[PDB]
Amino acid sequence: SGFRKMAFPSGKVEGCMVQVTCGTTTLNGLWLDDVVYCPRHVICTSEDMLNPNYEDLLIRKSNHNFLVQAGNVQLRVIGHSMQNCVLKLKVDTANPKTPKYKFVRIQPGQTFSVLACYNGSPSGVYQCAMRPNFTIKGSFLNGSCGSVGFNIDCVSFCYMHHMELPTGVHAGTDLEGNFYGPFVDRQTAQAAGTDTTITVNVLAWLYAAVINGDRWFLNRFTTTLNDFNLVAMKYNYEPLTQDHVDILGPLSAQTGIAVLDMCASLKELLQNGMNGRTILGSALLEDEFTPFDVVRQCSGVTF
Amino acid sequence: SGFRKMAFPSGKVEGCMVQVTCGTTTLNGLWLDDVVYCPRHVICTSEDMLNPNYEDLLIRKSNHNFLVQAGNVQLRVIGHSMQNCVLKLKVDTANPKTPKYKFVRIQPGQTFSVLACYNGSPSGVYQCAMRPNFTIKGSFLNGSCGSVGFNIDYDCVSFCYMHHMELPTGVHAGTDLEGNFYGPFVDRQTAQTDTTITVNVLAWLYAAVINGDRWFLNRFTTTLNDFNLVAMKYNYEPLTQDHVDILGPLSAQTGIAVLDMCASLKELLQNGMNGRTILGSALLEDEFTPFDVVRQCSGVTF
Ligand SMILES: *[C@H](O)[C@H](Cc1ccc[nH]c1=O)NC(=O)[C@H](CC1CCCCC1)NC(=O)c1cc2ccccc2[nH]1
Ligand SMILES: *[C@H](O)[C@H](Cc1ccc[nH]c1=O)NC(=O)[C@H](CC1CCCCC1)NC(=O)c1cc2ccccc2[nH]1
Ligand code: NA
């Protein structure tokens, strides 16, 4: 019993982290097979950062301009190319620690683990969700760029870190270099959209609470999907779809609480508040656990 | 910026986890050099459990009764002994992934990362505190026994917890790696008050300030004695001068004296948060030490 924000074990990703230096800038790279992936902004001088023309700047670089270090070993760069906002440095050695891996672009609400790194070395691991506004609420300092987010299914990499937006939230790309959200890699203040609560995840966590015997909030009513969403909207919650209802099905079967019944209990929590009570030790409704995250933790799924 | 409950990178510990089966019981072991450490209750049967005579039960086991699996390799057990509540299975192969390590016994209020494992395989990692009542508020299912807690400093893993049991309230109990339980608990089948870690709450308020969440700051100061009068009423541990000293680094970094911050905590205790949050929480958080805050906010690596 118990319910914690649980990250994936990080060892498989630790073995892939390297340091990449261009000029005055050092950040992290991801070494898989004979390629090192990192943010393309590594190539900017401080002046370049204001309005970079990355294609032009890259033409001026040579392979030797990229200093890639795996621990105490310098890797020899033999080619360089850019894919969207990610730089791909071909090296003459394949990483012997490369796990089975894939690159995935995740949807809002999906969670992942971040291995925060500086100078190619790990600082810590924590669980993040992709917010509906395409930011993540991470813990990233200058130097952390190139740190990645991942799931273990095969390691599925979904996020590479590029920048910190004005609200102290974080923005980055998938491993094909496409930003999540409308953001661009230029040194200017960029506003995130208004964020919302990930409803399907709140429902998942209420199921985790029931599994753990914390069930005071269960009421005796039901609701339709439409009537639930009419309330959700008023409290800045995302719409719940029928696909979400189906995804929550196995948790509904395990607990005996139909999804629409759980929605009626959530509706009451939204309308009346929690009145000083906690659920799974929290005084707020938690939205950074997906339905799979709940099953993973409550059933002991391993890797 | 940003502040998260961040666990240590777990790779060095993952390379030490093995599966240990005795009879019908499977749990995890920690393989360092040529010894596998695991809870001694692995040797109990369902009848053995009310008052197990572990010395006798261990004598009656063969090395052959312990099936130790490191991935897809069975390790040959060549000896079995016990140190307090930990079983030590000597194996004929030294773990080539053994990190630099120490066994440490931590104090209440200190934190560590747990690598939760099942069948010798890592499932997840999370940070938690040793409570003042010597339990941990973990996430552990049947089969997780032998999972460990640890801290890292540079290249050295300090193992501090091995998991043995879940108490009726759903919190968790275990030993150090010398086999001594934290708290009054015992490894037998029988039925077996906490406080808030004030210095950690203060550390986390400093973390909030460092990360720009400043609304709860006020212009007032308090004496240590006046603060503790309030603290005690809310079931907070007394703040000692030693605690004030340990908050020195964070006080210097923010420019906010400890007794200034204490007045902000006093107001939060007496008046609540008025619908606001601090670092995303609607409760005061006590599972970050002063060192944890400095580590995370300065980007310390391993
Ligand atoms: C990469 O290591 C670093 C990550 C970082 C820095 C500071 C705080 N948290 C962090 O995670 N990223 C930057 O420093 C980044 C570099 C810049 C990105 C666009 C292309 C050119 C290089 N810059 C920012 O994150 C940044 C710039 C800026 C300007 C106005 C407001 C906010 C802001 N954030
Ligand atoms: C070891 O893998 C397992 C850990 C566990 C089990 C269930 C839930 N969460 C967990 O972390 N430990 C046990 O199953 C343990 C065995 C027992 C330890 C003392 C010596 C003899 C063997 N039993 C418990 O943790 C346990 C039994 C029990 C009965 C009533 C209420 C609570 C309770 N906890
Ligand atoms: Na104050």
Side-chain angles (χ1 to χ4, degrees), chain A residues 27 41 44 49 54 140-145 161-166 170 184-189, chain B residues 1:
Chain A
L27 43 61
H41 70 65
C44 294
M49 291 178 183
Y54 285 103
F140 289 106
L141 309 162
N142 208 353
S144 66
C145 289
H161 183 55
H162 293 239
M163 63 205 202
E164 183 169 304
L165 301 178
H170 302 105
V184 296
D185 50 355
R186 185 163 92 62
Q187 184 177 301
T188 194
Chain B
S1 89

PDB file of all heavy atoms in Angstrom, chain A residues 27 41 44 49 54 140-145 161-166 170 184-189, chain B residues 1, ligand 1:
ATOM      1  N   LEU A  27      26.364  21.649 -22.711  1.00  0.00           N
ATOM      2  CA  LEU A  27      25.089  21.083 -22.279  1.00  0.00           C
ATOM      3  C   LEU A  27      25.183  19.568 -22.428  1.00  0.00           C
ATOM      4  O   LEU A  27      26.266  19.009 -22.627  1.00  0.00           O
ATOM      5  CB  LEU A  27      23.892  21.724 -22.991  1.00  0.00           C
ATOM      6  CG  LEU A  27      24.012  21.981 -24.496  1.00  0.00           C
ATOM      7  CD1 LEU A  27      24.236  20.678 -25.256  1.00  0.00           C
ATOM      8  CD2 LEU A  27      22.862  22.775 -25.092  1.00  0.00           C
ATOM      9  N   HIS A  41      20.620  24.797 -30.190  1.00  0.00           N
ATOM     10  CA  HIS A  41      21.122  26.063 -29.686  1.00  0.00           C
ATOM     11  C   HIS A  41      22.510  25.970 -29.086  1.00  0.00           C
ATOM     12  O   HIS A  41      23.099  27.012 -28.811  1.00  0.00           O
ATOM     13  CB  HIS A  41      20.102  26.785 -28.785  1.00  0.00           C
ATOM     14  CG  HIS A  41      19.830  26.155 -27.448  1.00  0.00           C
ATOM     15  ND1 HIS A  41      20.778  26.054 -26.455  1.00  0.00           N
ATOM     16  CD2 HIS A  41      18.678  25.689 -26.911  1.00  0.00           C
ATOM     17  CE1 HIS A  41      20.229  25.534 -25.370  1.00  0.00           C
ATOM     18  NE2 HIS A  41      18.950  25.320 -25.612  1.00  0.00           N
ATOM     19  N   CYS A  44      25.021  28.399 -30.743  1.00  0.00           N
ATOM     20  CA  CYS A  44      24.881  29.848 -30.738  1.00  0.00           C
ATOM     21  C   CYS A  44      25.927  30.486 -29.850  1.00  0.00           C
ATOM     22  O   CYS A  44      26.177  30.021 -28.742  1.00  0.00           O
ATOM     23  CB  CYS A  44      23.532  30.240 -30.168  1.00  0.00           C
ATOM     24  SG  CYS A  44      22.194  29.748 -31.171  1.00  0.00           S
ATOM     25  N   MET A  49      22.016  34.072 -29.999  1.00  0.00           N
ATOM     26  CA  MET A  49      20.805  33.592 -29.332  1.00  0.00           C
ATOM     27  C   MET A  49      19.617  34.515 -29.544  1.00  0.00           C
ATOM     28  O   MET A  49      18.470  34.055 -29.505  1.00  0.00           O
ATOM     29  CB  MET A  49      21.117  33.451 -27.841  1.00  0.00           C
ATOM     30  CG  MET A  49      22.095  32.325 -27.546  1.00  0.00           C
ATOM     31  SD  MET A  49      22.574  32.115 -25.820  1.00  0.00           S
ATOM     32  CE  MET A  49      23.774  30.796 -25.956  1.00  0.00           C
ATOM     33  N   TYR A  54      19.792  29.212 -37.797  1.00  0.00           N
ATOM     34  CA  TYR A  54      20.526  28.014 -37.422  1.00  0.00           C
ATOM     35  C   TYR A  54      21.181  27.336 -38.614  1.00  0.00           C
ATOM     36  O   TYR A  54      22.293  26.814 -38.483  1.00  0.00           O
ATOM     37  CB  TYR A  54      19.602  27.061 -36.692  1.00  0.00           C
ATOM     38  CG  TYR A  54      19.296  27.481 -35.271  1.00  0.00           C
ATOM     39  CD1 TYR A  54      18.084  28.061 -34.952  1.00  0.00           C
ATOM     40  CD2 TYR A  54      20.215  27.297 -34.265  1.00  0.00           C
ATOM     41  CE1 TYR A  54      17.787  28.417 -33.657  1.00  0.00           C
ATOM     42  CE2 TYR A  54      19.928  27.662 -32.950  1.00  0.00           C
ATOM     43  CZ  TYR A  54      18.721  28.231 -32.672  1.00  0.00           C
ATOM     44  OH  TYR A  54      18.469  28.550 -31.357  1.00  0.00           O
ATOM     45  N   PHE A 140      14.855  22.421 -13.502  1.00  0.00           N
ATOM     46  CA  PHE A 140      15.910  22.532 -14.503  1.00  0.00           C
ATOM     47  C   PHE A 140      16.625  23.860 -14.269  1.00  0.00           C
ATOM     48  O   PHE A 140      15.976  24.916 -14.235  1.00  0.00           O
ATOM     49  CB  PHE A 140      15.326  22.588 -15.921  1.00  0.00           C
ATOM     50  CG  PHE A 140      14.724  21.303 -16.435  1.00  0.00           C
ATOM     51  CD1 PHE A 140      13.357  21.183 -16.524  1.00  0.00           C
ATOM     52  CD2 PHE A 140      15.520  20.267 -16.912  1.00  0.00           C
ATOM     53  CE1 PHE A 140      12.778  20.035 -17.043  1.00  0.00           C
ATOM     54  CE2 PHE A 140      14.927  19.091 -17.445  1.00  0.00           C
ATOM     55  CZ  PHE A 140      13.559  19.015 -17.510  1.00  0.00           C
ATOM     56  N   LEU A 141      17.939  23.808 -14.147  1.00  0.00           N
ATOM     57  CA  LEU A 141      18.774  24.999 -14.035  1.00  0.00           C
ATOM     58  C   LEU A 141      19.525  25.208 -15.339  1.00  0.00           C
ATOM     59  O   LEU A 141      19.590  24.318 -16.182  1.00  0.00           O
ATOM     60  CB  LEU A 141      19.788  24.869 -12.899  1.00  0.00           C
ATOM     61  CG  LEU A 141      19.239  24.459 -11.537  1.00  0.00           C
ATOM     62  CD1 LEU A 141      20.347  23.961 -10.666  1.00  0.00           C
ATOM     63  CD2 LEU A 141      18.505  25.651 -10.921  1.00  0.00           C
ATOM     64  N   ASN A 142      20.151  26.379 -15.502  1.00  0.00           N
ATOM     65  CA  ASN A 142      21.055  26.549 -16.632  1.00  0.00           C
ATOM     66  C   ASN A 142      22.090  25.428 -16.636  1.00  0.00           C
ATOM     67  O   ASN A 142      22.649  25.055 -15.601  1.00  0.00           O
ATOM     68  CB  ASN A 142      21.753  27.919 -16.582  1.00  0.00           C
ATOM     69  CG  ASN A 142      22.139  28.425 -17.968  1.00  0.00           C
ATOM     70  OD1 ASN A 142      22.002  27.715 -18.971  1.00  0.00           O
ATOM     71  ND2 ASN A 142      22.630  29.655 -18.031  1.00  0.00           N
ATOM     72  N   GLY A 143      22.340  24.877 -17.826  1.00  0.00           N
ATOM     73  CA  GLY A 143      23.194  23.729 -17.973  1.00  0.00           C
ATOM     74  C   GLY A 143      22.440  22.429 -18.157  1.00  0.00           C
ATOM     75  O   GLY A 143      23.048  21.423 -18.547  1.00  0.00           O
ATOM     76  N   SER A 144      21.141  22.423 -17.870  1.00  0.00           N
ATOM     77  CA  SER A 144      20.379  21.183 -17.927  1.00  0.00           C
ATOM     78  C   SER A 144      19.895  20.847 -19.318  1.00  0.00           C
ATOM     79  O   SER A 144      19.364  19.759 -19.519  1.00  0.00           O
ATOM     80  CB  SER A 144      19.196  21.274 -16.978  1.00  0.00           C
ATOM     81  OG  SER A 144      18.267  22.258 -17.389  1.00  0.00           O
ATOM     82  N   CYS A 145      20.051  21.745 -20.276  1.00  0.00           N
ATOM     83  CA  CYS A 145      19.557  21.486 -21.617  1.00  0.00           C
ATOM     84  C   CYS A 145      20.165  20.203 -22.153  1.00  0.00           C
ATOM     85  O   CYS A 145      21.317  19.843 -21.878  1.00  0.00           O
ATOM     86  CB  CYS A 145      19.873  22.671 -22.528  1.00  0.00           C
ATOM     87  SG  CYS A 145      18.888  24.106 -22.137  1.00  0.00           S
ATOM     88  N   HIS A 161      15.178  18.718 -23.216  1.00  0.00           N
ATOM     89  CA  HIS A 161      14.986  20.029 -22.606  1.00  0.00           C
ATOM     90  C   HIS A 161      15.751  21.143 -23.324  1.00  0.00           C
ATOM     91  O   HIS A 161      16.936  20.985 -23.627  1.00  0.00           O
ATOM     92  CB  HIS A 161      15.438  19.975 -21.161  1.00  0.00           C
ATOM     93  CG  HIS A 161      15.204  21.255 -20.453  1.00  0.00           C
ATOM     94  ND1 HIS A 161      13.956  21.834 -20.410  1.00  0.00           N
ATOM     95  CD2 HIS A 161      16.049  22.093 -19.808  1.00  0.00           C
ATOM     96  CE1 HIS A 161      14.046  22.979 -19.761  1.00  0.00           C
ATOM     97  NE2 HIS A 161      15.298  23.161 -19.392  1.00  0.00           N
ATOM     98  N   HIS A 162      15.072  22.257 -23.600  1.00  0.00           N
ATOM     99  CA  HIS A 162      15.690  23.407 -24.287  1.00  0.00           C
ATOM    100  C   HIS A 162      15.651  24.727 -23.528  1.00  0.00           C
ATOM    101  O   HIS A 162      16.576  25.541 -23.695  1.00  0.00           O
ATOM    102  CB  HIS A 162      15.046  23.697 -25.670  1.00  0.00           C
ATOM    103  CG  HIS A 162      15.280  22.638 -26.690  1.00  0.00           C
ATOM    104  ND1 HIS A 162      15.912  22.871 -27.899  1.00  0.00           N
ATOM    105  CD2 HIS A 162      14.929  21.335 -26.699  1.00  0.00           C
ATOM    106  CE1 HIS A 162      15.958  21.750 -28.589  1.00  0.00           C
ATOM    107  NE2 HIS A 162      15.363  20.799 -27.890  1.00  0.00           N
ATOM    108  N   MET A 163      14.589  25.043 -22.780  1.00  0.00           N
ATOM    109  CA  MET A 163      14.506  26.397 -22.240  1.00  0.00           C
ATOM    110  C   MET A 163      13.488  26.504 -21.118  1.00  0.00           C
ATOM    111  O   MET A 163      12.654  25.610 -20.916  1.00  0.00           O
ATOM    112  CB  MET A 163      14.223  27.418 -23.337  1.00  0.00           C
ATOM    113  CG  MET A 163      12.932  27.206 -23.992  1.00  0.00           C
ATOM    114  SD  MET A 163      12.857  27.894 -25.707  1.00  0.00           S
ATOM    115  CE  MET A 163      11.080  28.037 -25.832  1.00  0.00           C
ATOM    116  N   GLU A 164      13.596  27.611 -20.377  1.00  0.00           N
ATOM    117  CA  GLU A 164      12.718  27.918 -19.253  1.00  0.00           C
ATOM    118  C   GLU A 164      11.912  29.165 -19.606  1.00  0.00           C
ATOM    119  O   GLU A 164      12.495  30.225 -19.885  1.00  0.00           O
ATOM    120  CB  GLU A 164      13.499  28.137 -17.957  1.00  0.00           C
ATOM    121  CG  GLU A 164      12.544  28.375 -16.769  1.00  0.00           C
ATOM    122  CD  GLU A 164      13.220  28.340 -15.437  1.00  0.00           C
ATOM    123  OE1 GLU A 164      13.862  27.326 -15.135  1.00  0.00           O
ATOM    124  OE2 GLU A 164      13.086  29.338 -14.669  1.00  0.00           O
ATOM    125  N   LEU A 165      10.610  29.042 -19.593  1.00  0.00           N
ATOM    126  CA  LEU A 165       9.709  30.123 -19.914  1.00  0.00           C
ATOM    127  C   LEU A 165       9.527  31.028 -18.710  1.00  0.00           C
ATOM    128  O   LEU A 165       9.846  30.657 -17.580  1.00  0.00           O
ATOM    129  CB  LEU A 165       8.342  29.566 -20.313  1.00  0.00           C
ATOM    130  CG  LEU A 165       8.378  28.628 -21.508  1.00  0.00           C
ATOM    131  CD1 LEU A 165       6.995  28.075 -21.835  1.00  0.00           C
ATOM    132  CD2 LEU A 165       8.978  29.283 -22.718  1.00  0.00           C
ATOM    133  N   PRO A 166       9.003  32.226 -18.935  1.00  0.00           N
ATOM    134  CA  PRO A 166       8.892  33.208 -17.848  1.00  0.00           C
ATOM    135  C   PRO A 166       8.191  32.746 -16.588  1.00  0.00           C
ATOM    136  O   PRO A 166       8.530  33.240 -15.503  1.00  0.00           O
ATOM    137  CB  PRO A 166       8.170  34.376 -18.532  1.00  0.00           C
ATOM    138  CG  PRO A 166       8.670  34.319 -19.925  1.00  0.00           C
ATOM    139  CD  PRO A 166       8.763  32.836 -20.252  1.00  0.00           C
ATOM    140  N   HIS A 170       8.827  24.830 -18.191  1.00  0.00           N
ATOM    141  CA  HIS A 170       9.879  24.355 -19.074  1.00  0.00           C
ATOM    142  C   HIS A 170       9.340  23.921 -20.424  1.00  0.00           C
ATOM    143  O   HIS A 170       8.210  23.439 -20.553  1.00  0.00           O
ATOM    144  CB  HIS A 170      10.646  23.256 -18.375  1.00  0.00           C
ATOM    145  CG  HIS A 170      11.231  23.730 -17.095  1.00  0.00           C
ATOM    146  ND1 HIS A 170      10.712  23.398 -15.861  1.00  0.00           N
ATOM    147  CD2 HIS A 170      12.220  24.623 -16.868  1.00  0.00           C
ATOM    148  CE1 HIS A 170      11.401  24.026 -14.926  1.00  0.00           C
ATOM    149  NE2 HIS A 170      12.317  24.781 -15.510  1.00  0.00           N
ATOM    150  N   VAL A 184       9.549  28.704 -29.690  1.00  0.00           N
ATOM    151  CA  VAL A 184      10.665  28.695 -30.621  1.00  0.00           C
ATOM    152  C   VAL A 184      11.964  28.859 -29.852  1.00  0.00           C
ATOM    153  O   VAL A 184      12.000  29.476 -28.785  1.00  0.00           O
ATOM    154  CB  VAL A 184      10.509  29.806 -31.686  1.00  0.00           C
ATOM    155  CG1 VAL A 184       9.286  29.554 -32.538  1.00  0.00           C
ATOM    156  CG2 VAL A 184      10.422  31.185 -31.049  1.00  0.00           C
ATOM    157  N   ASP A 185      13.056  28.366 -30.447  1.00  0.00           N
ATOM    158  CA  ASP A 185      14.377  28.482 -29.823  1.00  0.00           C
ATOM    159  C   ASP A 185      15.074  29.784 -30.229  1.00  0.00           C
ATOM    160  O   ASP A 185      15.997  29.818 -31.048  1.00  0.00           O
ATOM    161  CB  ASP A 185      15.250  27.234 -30.009  1.00  0.00           C
ATOM    162  CG  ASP A 185      15.347  26.720 -31.453  1.00  0.00           C
ATOM    163  OD1 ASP A 185      14.679  27.226 -32.383  1.00  0.00           O
ATOM    164  OD2 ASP A 185      16.149  25.782 -31.645  1.00  0.00           O
ATOM    165  N   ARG A 186      14.612  30.864 -29.612  1.00  0.00           N
ATOM    166  CA  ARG A 186      15.174  32.204 -29.685  1.00  0.00           C
ATOM    167  C   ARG A 186      15.107  32.810 -28.294  1.00  0.00           C
ATOM    168  O   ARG A 186      14.200  32.498 -27.522  1.00  0.00           O
ATOM    169  CB  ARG A 186      14.294  33.073 -30.606  1.00  0.00           C
ATOM    170  CG  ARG A 186      14.797  34.448 -30.878  1.00  0.00           C
ATOM    171  CD  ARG A 186      14.103  35.039 -32.094  1.00  0.00           C
ATOM    172  NE  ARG A 186      12.917  35.818 -31.760  1.00  0.00           N
ATOM    173  CZ  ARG A 186      12.918  36.914 -31.006  1.00  0.00           C
ATOM    174  NH1 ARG A 186      14.030  37.375 -30.449  1.00  0.00           N
ATOM    175  NH2 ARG A 186      11.778  37.561 -30.801  1.00  0.00           N
ATOM    176  N   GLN A 187      16.073  33.678 -27.967  1.00  0.00           N
ATOM    177  CA  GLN A 187      16.142  34.332 -26.646  1.00  0.00           C
ATOM    178  C   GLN A 187      15.172  35.504 -26.589  1.00  0.00           C
ATOM    179  O   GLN A 187      15.532  36.656 -26.840  1.00  0.00           O
ATOM    180  CB  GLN A 187      17.557  34.800 -26.329  1.00  0.00           C
ATOM    181  CG  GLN A 187      17.750  35.399 -24.931  1.00  0.00           C
ATOM    182  CD  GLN A 187      19.185  35.754 -24.680  1.00  0.00           C
ATOM    183  OE1 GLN A 187      20.065  34.902 -24.739  1.00  0.00           O
ATOM    184  NE2 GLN A 187      19.443  37.024 -24.396  1.00  0.00           N
ATOM    185  N   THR A 188      13.933  35.207 -26.216  1.00  0.00           N
ATOM    186  CA  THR A 188      12.876  36.202 -26.041  1.00  0.00           C
ATOM    187  C   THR A 188      11.842  35.577 -25.113  1.00  0.00           C
ATOM    188  O   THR A 188      11.687  34.353 -25.083  1.00  0.00           O
ATOM    189  CB  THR A 188      12.248  36.604 -27.373  1.00  0.00           C
ATOM    190  OG1 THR A 188      11.471  37.797 -27.169  1.00  0.00           O
ATOM    191  CG2 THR A 188      11.374  35.495 -27.933  1.00  0.00           C
ATOM    192  N   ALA A 189      11.145  36.408 -24.353  1.00  0.00           N
ATOM    193  CA  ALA A 189      10.145  35.906 -23.413  1.00  0.00           C
ATOM    194  C   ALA A 189       8.911  35.428 -24.173  1.00  0.00           C
ATOM    195  O   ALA A 189       8.341  36.161 -24.990  1.00  0.00           O
ATOM    196  CB  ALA A 189       9.770  37.023 -22.433  1.00  0.00           C
TER     197      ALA A 189
ATOM    198  N   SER B   1      14.951  26.898 -12.753  1.00  0.00           N
ATOM    199  CA  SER B   1      14.039  26.967 -11.587  1.00  0.00           C
ATOM    200  C   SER B   1      13.051  25.801 -11.586  1.00  0.00           C
ATOM    201  O   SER B   1      13.081  24.937 -12.478  1.00  0.00           O
ATOM    202  CB  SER B   1      13.402  28.359 -11.513  1.00  0.00           C
ATOM    203  OG  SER B   1      12.226  28.454 -12.228  1.00  0.00           O
TER     204      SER B   1
HETATM  205  C1  LIG C   1      19.937  25.196 -21.329  1.00  0.00           C
HETATM  206  O1  LIG C   1      20.851  24.590 -20.426  1.00  0.00           O
HETATM  207  C2  LIG C   1      19.174  26.298 -20.546  1.00  0.00           C
HETATM  208  C3  LIG C   1      18.180  25.714 -19.537  1.00  0.00           C
HETATM  209  C4  LIG C   1      17.781  26.677 -18.415  1.00  0.00           C
HETATM  210  C5  LIG C   1      18.337  27.943 -18.241  1.00  0.00           C
HETATM  211  C6  LIG C   1      17.878  28.723 -17.177  1.00  0.00           C
HETATM  212  C7  LIG C   1      16.898  28.231 -16.343  1.00  0.00           C
HETATM  213  N1  LIG C   1      16.395  27.022 -16.546  1.00  0.00           N
HETATM  214  C8  LIG C   1      16.788  26.254 -17.549  1.00  0.00           C
HETATM  215  O2  LIG C   1      16.290  25.177 -17.700  1.00  0.00           O
HETATM  216  N2  LIG C   1      18.472  27.090 -21.539  1.00  0.00           N
HETATM  217  C9  LIG C   1      18.697  28.489 -21.700  1.00  0.00           C
HETATM  218  O3  LIG C   1      19.423  29.122 -20.997  1.00  0.00           O
HETATM  219  C10 LIG C   1      17.922  29.028 -22.864  1.00  0.00           C
HETATM  220  C11 LIG C   1      18.913  29.127 -24.053  1.00  0.00           C
HETATM  221  C12 LIG C   1      18.363  29.788 -25.312  1.00  0.00           C
HETATM  222  C13 LIG C   1      17.106  29.058 -25.799  1.00  0.00           C
HETATM  223  C14 LIG C   1      16.632  29.651 -27.128  1.00  0.00           C
HETATM  224  C15 LIG C   1      17.746  29.647 -28.178  1.00  0.00           C
HETATM  225  C16 LIG C   1      18.989  30.368 -27.688  1.00  0.00           C
HETATM  226  C17 LIG C   1      19.495  29.840 -26.351  1.00  0.00           C
HETATM  227  N3  LIG C   1      17.315  30.301 -22.638  1.00  0.00           N
HETATM  228  C18 LIG C   1      16.180  30.329 -21.813  1.00  0.00           C
HETATM  229  O4  LIG C   1      15.727  29.330 -21.314  1.00  0.00           O
HETATM  230  C19 LIG C   1      15.503  31.662 -21.686  1.00  0.00           C
HETATM  231  C20 LIG C   1      15.752  32.813 -22.446  1.00  0.00           C
HETATM  232  C21 LIG C   1      14.797  33.767 -22.020  1.00  0.00           C
HETATM  233  C22 LIG C   1      14.541  35.106 -22.358  1.00  0.00           C
HETATM  234  C23 LIG C   1      13.498  35.754 -21.703  1.00  0.00           C
HETATM  235  C24 LIG C   1      12.735  35.094 -20.725  1.00  0.00           C
HETATM  236  C25 LIG C   1      12.977  33.776 -20.393  1.00  0.00           C
HETATM  237  C26 LIG C   1      14.039  33.122 -21.055  1.00  0.00           C
HETATM  238  N4  LIG C   1      14.471  31.841 -20.894  1.00  0.00           N
END
